[PDB]
């Protein structure tokens, strides 16, 4: 099924996923498609930040749901 990931930059990323996919699977898909490593990604759905070992179905993310991506910031 398709979900959307909306950034804070006016971009929407489309992903192909299954309900059984984990959040870390989803972040890997973002890296594969968009080039952002998983450790920089924070995903938010329904006001809450998503945790790596849970599944999309654990948060009731379904066909055409929109998640939000906010990046960490590191200077070093």
């Amino acid at each position: 099924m398709q979900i959307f990931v909306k950034t804070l930059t006016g971009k929407t990323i489309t992903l192909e996923v299954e309900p059984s996919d984990t959040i870390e699977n989803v972040k890997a898909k973002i890296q594969d498609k968009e080039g952002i490593p998983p450790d920089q990604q924070r995903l938010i759905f329904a006001g809450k930040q998503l945790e790596d070992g849970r599944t999309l179905s654990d948060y009731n993310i379904q066909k055409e749901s929109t998640l939000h991506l906010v990046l960490r910031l590191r200077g070093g």
Binding site: T7, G10, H68, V70, R72, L73, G76
Partner: protein, 186 residues
């Protein structure tokens, strides 16, 4: 009158940067700078008629050392930006005692911002030198180097030129526009 292009020939839209922002940032993080601690902030704003305007300098919840800084509560930052319909246009941070340049870590960070917005900028303030600089990765070549990178080590180098300063007149233009500073710290 002035149009900028990436290395691969893609159009870059103008970012209007308030003249006061650099100074105001330094003032607002000065306490840290004094304790030899780094600080970072987010450059936030709006798109109007094919140009971006920086309107908000947002200081997120963070942790720091004399040579690193990082966010610790990006959900609070998302909530603020979402509620106020503010775009992420780039970021700024201090090198309290070092020169003005982009570190390996800095490039790994900026790459992701610049992947999400081609115009994204990284402002580095070097107060002990009274220098500063506005940087971006080379596009596509610098972005490609960092996306494919799998080297460990906080300080690993990269093969080739990776980044550049924004040009003058540029895609970044410094204008006398107003600014709001939002401090999300305790």
């Amino acid at each position: 009158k002035i149009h900028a292009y990436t290395e691969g020939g893609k159009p870059l839209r103008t970012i209007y940067l308030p003249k006061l922002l650099k100074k105001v940032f330094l003032d607002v993080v000065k306490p840290n700078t004094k304790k030899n601690l780094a600080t970072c902030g987010i450059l936030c704003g709006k798109l109007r008629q094919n140009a971006f305007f920086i309107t908000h300098l947002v200081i997120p919840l963070q942790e720091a050392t004399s040579d690193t800084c990082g966010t610790t509560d990006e959900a609070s930052l998302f909530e603020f930006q979402d509620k106020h319909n503010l775009l992420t246009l780039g970021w700024i941070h201090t090198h309290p005692t070092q020169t003005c340049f982009m570190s390996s870590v800095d490039l790994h960070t900026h790459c992701s911002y610049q992947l999400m917005l081609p115009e994204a900028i990284a402002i580095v303030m070097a107060p002990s030198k009274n220098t500063s600089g506005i940087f971006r990765l080379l596009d596509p070549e610098g972005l490609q180097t960092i996306v494919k990178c799998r080297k460990p080590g906080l300080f690993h180098p990269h093969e080739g030129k990776v980044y550049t300063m924004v040009a003058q007149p540029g895609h970044v233009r410094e204008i006398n526009s107003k600014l709001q500073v939002v401090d999300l710290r305790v």
